[PDB]
Amino acid sequence: SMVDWKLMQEIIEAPGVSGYEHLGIRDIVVDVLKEVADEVKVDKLGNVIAHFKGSSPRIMVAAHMDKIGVMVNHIDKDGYLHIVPIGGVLPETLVAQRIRFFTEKGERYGVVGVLPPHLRIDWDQIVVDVGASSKEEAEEMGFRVGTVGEFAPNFTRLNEHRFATPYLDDRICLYAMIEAARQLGDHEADIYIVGSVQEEVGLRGARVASYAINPEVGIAMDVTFAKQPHDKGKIVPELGKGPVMDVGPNINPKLRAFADEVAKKYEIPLQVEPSPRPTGTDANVMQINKEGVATAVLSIPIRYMHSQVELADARDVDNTIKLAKALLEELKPMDFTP
Amino acid sequence: SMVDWKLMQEIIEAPGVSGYEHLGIRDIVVDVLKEVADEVKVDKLGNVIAHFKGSSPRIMVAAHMDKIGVMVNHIDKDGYLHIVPIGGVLPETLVAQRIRFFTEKGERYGVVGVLPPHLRIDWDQIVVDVGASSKEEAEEMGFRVGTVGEFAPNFTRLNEHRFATPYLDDRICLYAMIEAARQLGDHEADIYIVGSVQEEVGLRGARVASYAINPEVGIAMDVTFAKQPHDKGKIVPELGKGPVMDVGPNINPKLRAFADEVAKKYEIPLQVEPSPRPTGTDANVMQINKEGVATAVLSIPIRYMHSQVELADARDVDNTIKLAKALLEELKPMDFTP
Amino acid sequence: SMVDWKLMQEIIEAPGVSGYEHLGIRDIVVDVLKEVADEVKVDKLGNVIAHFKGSSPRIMVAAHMDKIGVMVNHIDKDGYLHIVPIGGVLPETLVAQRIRFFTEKGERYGVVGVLPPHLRIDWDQIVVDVGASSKEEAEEMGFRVGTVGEFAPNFTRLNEHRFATPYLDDRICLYAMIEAARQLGDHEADIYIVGSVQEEVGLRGARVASYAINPEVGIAMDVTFAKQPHDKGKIVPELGKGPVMDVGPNINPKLRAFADEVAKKYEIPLQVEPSPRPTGTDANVMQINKEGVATAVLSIPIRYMHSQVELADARDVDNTIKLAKALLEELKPMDFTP
Ligand SMILES: [Cl-]
Ligand SMILES: [Cl-]
Ligand SMILES: [Cl-]
Ligand SMILES: [Cl-]
Ligand SMILES: [Cl-]
Ligand SMILES: [Cl-]
Ligand SMILES: [Zn+2]
Ligand SMILES: [Zn+2]
Ligand SMILES: [Zn+2]
Ligand SMILES: [Zn+2]
Ligand SMILES: [Zn+2]
Ligand SMILES: [Zn+2]
């Protein structure tokens, strides 16, 4: 298990909003997995699919490579950018923030300004300043209709265990899945490790990857909500209390019971999240793939999801790596029929 | 046809909310169908698929086994449960009601309390009392994060024909489909009778069952809205006027015309429901399965859908059994191209 | 003391809304009291007055036989009932509930329906379905202008001590008073045990019973509010902490002090409720009867008053039986002058 802070930060900060995972994260995932997998391929949507050959059952584990972000809708006559969200970016988190754009002339920053109080929440109030003085100048700088951008990186390690940064969702789980894969010992299962694309715009990469792989078992590794201020006591998982595994309709009872047994065997703390609906993770589309798949969700709890200050606890990451590795190594043929 | 009140009530009251159909209803459906079907199997999502071997066309008929219900989100320090809905349960129907929970220690009841007027619609106002005095006590009683519950059974036969009970949706149609199956005589069609899972959380079981079966023809048997107080005259079907079959984009014109001819031949009253959108039934996902399926919806009209007092007329149930049996027996190869 | 669950449930479920206590509860109260009382009579309003002859002081103990309920205002052309409340029934507790009506053709049920969300708290939204299709049919079924109904029975024992059911108010105290009466040993006081009528519509039976009895001392046994969710910490009594006895203007200080001494002597836990106003119980009218009466209130705490899920703790019922018996046996001439 054990957290490699340098690799983890590299995986978090690599470029790749939904539909543009090829801008950086994809090559990193391919390179790290090619060293340990029997075969790694990239499909037409950009999913990275790494095969660790085994016997049975066939399992697909998916963590998504894409980040939420923004796209330039148009550039105005004074050289300001008007942007729209890619995935669940909320306008409130954009005020007085830096955005990292992927322009024709490399990575370039812009800022979302604020109007001083004496001149006075929605997308129309959001205008990006890139230091340009005209539309022509912004265009010469490399900005275009369709230019995409991300929250600017800011990795903050607060103490021994806690850290805050944009894009723990889902780079922290992609990191954990990749570490589990690198540490993977012998296993009976036929394992596909998938870096999925476009999770944040409707689970689109995992949909096609599941179709091609045709797994019997599916596990999505995505982040989940942790107890935090103003949550009204409604959130069950807490930072530092371990990986989280949902229960509910998206979650095969036999697979979820198997996961409990494994967690107990390896003495890994395991939290329960009640999910009464099909989840908002790749496991949603994996479960209803083709003839149906036995699915579960394995999550790292974070605070402040979908903002620049997503915050996690490295003890949870470590234990998630350990649990993913143990599930993959312990998995064996069994009857998943509910 | 003919209504078997005892079997019908047993099928209505068997446990099984979305994702937990294995708690009771599934075994009943398997047992009754195994007696008449050539083969019955349960898939990975829990669908019951019973094959009545025939020639052509291949038809799938689906009625869903799952009920809407609730799930325990957390237990508070005073031993009260805080719940969230599974499917379309509305908070208004929970006030001063009993809930039947499926705990580690068998079935146990709780009540949703009301606040006396002198101390004064949303989920936060909903708190379940299970007779416990602390979190530890509620847990010893068997309640957990993730415990599921249902409207408590209350079967009320009002007169010769009308009756009200929780969960006519969709146990009344599952009952009707099962009776039609038991009475099924010779048939040319290759018939799959499916007890589907997770209809109430997005048609998920019928999606995978349709994929595996690959039918040419699909019929969903689900309940529909009947004329009732305060409906502003907008609902077409009425209690006691027979089974209902939609018309609209989800409904293959040739199959629907065939259904009219059959209803006329057997002198079965048949109501028309205008459905301008893809339906909220299993026929939605059956129609867009693989290369496409000729689909129709065959419904029993009920009042007060998704509440504890869903109300139907046994004459409609009888006629639905008769019509389902006749469609299956009359179905023959034909061109379904619109 | 000791709770007889079978008798208690029978007393709770016997028919009898305000003004219609003769439909069942009255005969039960008469029959049980006739076995132990020197004389039992029923007055013109329907009060049951049982005399246990003694010396002094003359005491009247009253628990009310009436339930809150509903009455049919009119039947509409489609056979639905439109109802109005008898006593403090709130429209919110009627949604998707069953009502037990007392018709010309025996007990018959109806349901209060709900309007599905896509077609959208006050009495005009409340319409009762009885399975009829026309006004004439509902009338043939026995429904009339003036037909009365009750919350349908649903007795739920949650565990060893806690239980929830419609109509703990005031059948639980009527049960406790009746058990105390049956266990009553020697006593100096001249005791009248009264099953009062029409408490829920303005304390009307206790008014005339007090006039006829002319007691020197009066105790009302009615339920009171217990700590429960969303009460904002404003309710003092709690389930399981014993009978409750108010303090305040309705409560004679000498009698209330005597009650404390008795509770201490018999080691019965006794809660205090602050009541700054004349109470909403029979003790209100007893106190201002004729030349004035020394009065107190002895209550069983319940949650969710006036709803179908009123919830109590059998330890409190037991201790209330014990305290009532001890007060009656210990009572002796004393000066009640404040
Ligand atoms: Cl996500
Ligand atoms: Cl294959
Ligand atoms: Cl439905
Ligand atoms: Cl085929
Ligand atoms: Cl009262
Ligand atoms: Cl006198
Ligand atoms: Zn996300
Ligand atoms: Zn994510
Ligand atoms: Zn439904
Ligand atoms: Zn349905
Ligand atoms: Zn009352
Ligand atoms: Zn009362």
What DSSP line would sit under B49-67, residue for residue? EEEE--SSSEEEEEEE--B
Q: Write out the two tokens for B192.
A: 């799959």
The C-alpha atoms of residue A59 and residue A50 are separated, in whole angstroms, by 12
Residue C186 assigned ligand-binding role: no
Instruction: Judge if A74 and A56 occupy the same domain.
Output: no
**Which of A249, A291, A336 has the CB atom closest to B208's CB atom?**
A291
β pairing state of C244-247 and C271-274: parallel
Instruction: Judge if B22 and B87 occupy the same domain.
Output: no
Into how many domains does chain B fold? 2
**Strand ranges for chain A from DSSP E:** 39-42, 48-52, 58-64, 69-75, 81-86, 98-103, 106-112, 128-129, 148-151, 156-157, 162-164, 190-196, 217-225, 244-247, 271-274, 294-302, 311-313
How would DSSP label each residue in A177-234?
HHHHHHH----SSEEEEEEES-GGGTSHHHHHHHHHH--SEEEEEEEEE---TTSTT-
Instruction: Judge if B193 and B309 occupy the same domain.
Output: yes
Q: State the first-to-last Cα distance of chain A, in angstroms, to the nearest integer.
A: 32
Nearest-CA neighbor of B157 among B325, B3, B328?
B3
Instruction: Judge if B91 and B145 occupy the same domain.
Output: yes
Nearest-CA neighbor of B150 among B80, B83, B67, B87?
B67
Q: Write out the two tokens for A207.
A: 């949909």
Residue B200 assigned ligand-binding role: yes
**Which of B96, B231, B304 has the CB atom closest to C93's CB atom?**
B96
- Minimum Cα–Cα distance from B92: chain C residue: C95
Ligand nearest to C-alpha A190: 2
Ligand nearest to C-alpha C289: 6
The SS3 call for residue C208 is helix
Alpha-carbon gap: A80 to the closest alpha carbon of chain B (Å): 42
Helices (H) and strands (E) in chain A, counts: 8, 17
Ligand nearest to C-alpha B305: 9
How many angstroms separate the Cα of C226 from the Cα of each of A99, A167, B191, C171?
Answer: 56, 49, 59, 17
Instruction: Judge if B147 and B158 occupy the same domain.
Output: no
How many angstroms separate the Cα of B188 from the Cα of each of B12, B59, B218, B327, C74?
Answer: 31, 11, 15, 11, 55
Contact B156 C109 (CB under 8 A): yes
Structural biology method used: X-ray
**Neighboring chain C residues of B95 at a CB cutoff of 8 Å:** 92-93, 95, 307
**Which of C80, C156, C309 has the CB atom closest to B96's CB atom?**
C309
Tell the burial category of C237 from Cβ atoms under 10 Å away from its Cβ (0-12, 13-18, 19+): buried
Contact A272 B124 (CB under 8 A): no
Instruction: Judge if B171 and B76 occupy the same domain.
Output: no
Contact, A266 vs A326, CB < 8 A? yes
**Neighboring chain C residues of B162 at a CB cutoff of 8 Å:** 131
The C-alpha atoms of residue A291 and residue B203 are separated, in whole angstroms, by 14
CA atoms lying within 13 Å on the CB side of residue A10: 12
The SS3 call for residue A102 is strand
**Neighboring chain A residues of B42 at a CB cutoff of 8 Å:** 337-338
Distance C64 CA to ligand 5 centre (A): 8
The SS3 call for residue A104 is coil
Edge to edge, what strands does the sheet with A244-247 contain? A39-42, A48-52, A190-196, A58-64, A217-225, A294-302, A244-247, A271-274
The C-alpha atoms of residue A161 and residue A156 are separated, in whole angstroms, by 11
The SS3 call for residue A296 is strand
User: Which CATH number do you get for residue C294?
Assistant: 3.40.630.10
Alpha-carbon gap: A290 to the closest alpha carbon of chain B (Å): 6
**Neighboring chain B residues of C110 at a CB cutoff of 8 Å:** 158
Ligand nearest to C-alpha C280: 5
Catalytic residue among B13, B21, B199, B216: B199
Based on C-alpha coordinates, what's the Rg of chain C?
Answer: 20
Alpha-carbon gap: A272 to the closest alpha carbon of chain B (Å): 7
Contact B230 C156 (CB under 8 A): no
Contact, B24 vs B153, CB < 8 A? no
Q: Which of C114, C130, C152 is the last residue before a domain boundary?
A: C152
Do B and C make contact via 3 or more CB pairs under 8 A? The reply is yes
Contact, B50 vs B40, CB < 8 A? yes
Contact B19 A216 (CB under 8 A): no
The SS3 call for residue A143 is coil
Nearest-CA neighbor of B314 among B178, B172, B179?
B172
Based on C-alpha coordinates, what's the Rg of chain A?
Answer: 20
The C-alpha atoms of residue A43 and residue A51 are separated, in whole angstroms, by 13
Q: Write out the two tokens for C225.
A: 């509010």
- Report chain B residues touching chain A, CB-CB < 8 A: 18-22, 26, 42-47, 70-74, 76, 82, 84-86, 124, 144-146, 198, 201-202, 204, 207-208, 211-212
Contact A274 B70 (CB under 8 A): no
The C-alpha atoms of residue B235 and residue B227 are separated, in whole angstroms, by 5
Q: Write out the two tokens for A135.
A: 């539309």
Alpha-carbon gap: B181 to the closest alpha carbon of chain C (Å): 29
Q: Write out the two tokens for C199.
A: 């408490």
Instruction: Judge if A2 and A78 occupy the same domain.
Output: no
What residues form DSSP beta bridges with B223?
Answer: B300
Contacts of C264 (CB under 8 A, 6+ apart): none
**Neighboring chain B residues of A287 at a CB cutoff of 8 Å:** 45, 204
**Neighboring chain A residues of B74 at a CB cutoff of 8 Å:** 233-234, 236, 274
Write the Ramachandran bin of B15: left for phi over 0, alpha for psi from -120 to 50, otherwise beta.
beta
- Please tell me what DSSP assigns to residue C133: S
The SS3 call for residue B258 is helix
- Minimum Cα–Cα distance from A252: chain B residue: B45
Q: How many Cβ pairs within 8 Å bridge chains A and B?
A: 85
- Minimum Cα–Cα distance from C79: chain B residue: B229
Contacts of A117 (CB under 8 A, 6+ apart): none
* Residues of C assigned a catalytic role: 199
- Minimum Cα–Cα distance from A275: chain B residue: B146
Alpha-carbon gap: B90 to the closest alpha carbon of chain A (Å): 14
CA atoms lying within 13 Å on the CB side of residue C250: 22
- Minimum Cα–Cα distance from A236: chain B residue: B74
Distance C257 CA to ligand 6 centre (A): 26
What residues form DSSP beta bridges with B244?
Answer: B271, B299
What residues form DSSP beta bridges with A196?
Answer: A64
**Neighboring chain B residues of C129 at a CB cutoff of 8 Å:** 158, 164, 228-229, 303-304, 309, 311
Instruction: Judge if A117 and A231 occupy the same domain.
Output: no
- Touching subunits of B (3+ CB pairs, under 8 Å) are A, C
Q: Kindly report the number of other CB atoms within 10 A of residue C3's CB atom.
A: 18
Q: Write out the two tokens for B285.
A: 């996902």
Contacts of B78 (CB under 8 A, 6+ apart): B132, B133, B134, B135, C229
The SS3 call for residue B288 is coil
Instruction: Judge if C317 and C234 occupy the same domain.
Output: yes
Nearest-CA neighbor of A123 among A74, A168, A67, A66?
A74
Nearest-CA neighbor of C11 among C149, C157, C165?
C165
**Which of B46, B85, B124 has the CB atom closest to A338's CB atom?**
B46
In chain C, % helix, strand, coil (3-state, to 5) comes to 30, 25, 40
Instruction: Judge if C159 and C98 occupy the same domain.
Output: no
Nearest-CA neighbor of B210 among C171, A291, A273?
A291
Instruction: Judge if A270 and A321 occupy the same domain.
Output: yes
- Minimum Cα–Cα distance from C230: chain B residue: B115
Alpha-carbon gap: B20 to the closest alpha carbon of chain A (Å): 7
Torsion of CA C158, C163, C167, C171, to 10 degrees: 150
Torsion of CA A206, A211, A215, A220, to 10 degrees: 10
Residue C22 assigned ligand-binding role: no
Edge to edge, what strands does the sheet with A311-313 contain? A156-157, A162-164, A311-313
Nearest-CA neighbor of C158 among B103, B21, B167, B155?
B103
Place of tokens 């009200």: B164
β pairing state of C217-225 and C58-64: parallel
Ligand nearest to C-alpha A290: 2
Place of tokens 């979190």: B135
The C-alpha atoms of residue C173 and residue C298 are separated, in whole angstroms, by 9
Helix (H) or strand (E) holding B194: strand B190-196
**Breaks (C–N over 2.5 Å) after residues, chain B:** 120
Range of the domain at A307: 1-67+153-338
Nearest-CA neighbor of C215 among C325, C52, C338?
C52
User: Which CATH number do you get for residue C142?
Assistant: 2.40.30.40
Instruction: Judge if C23 and C74 occupy the same domain.
Output: no
Sequence letter at residue C23: L
**Neighboring chain B residues of A294 at a CB cutoff of 8 Å:** 44
Q: Which of C152, C180, C208 is the last residue before a domain boundary?
A: C152
The C-alpha atoms of residue C242 and residue C331 are separated, in whole angstroms, by 21
Instruction: Name the phi and psi angles at B18, rounded to 5.
Output: -50, 125
The C-alpha atoms of residue B275 and residue B238 are separated, in whole angstroms, by 16
**Which of B80, B98, B154 has the CB atom closest to C229's CB atom?**
B80
Q: Write out the two tokens for A247.
A: 């229960």
Does the active-site annotation cover A160?
Answer: no
Residue A64 assigned ligand-binding role: yes
Q: Which of C152, C183, C207 is the last residue before a domain boundary?
A: C152
ω into residue A231 within 30 of 0, thus cis?
A: no
Contact B145 A274 (CB under 8 A): yes
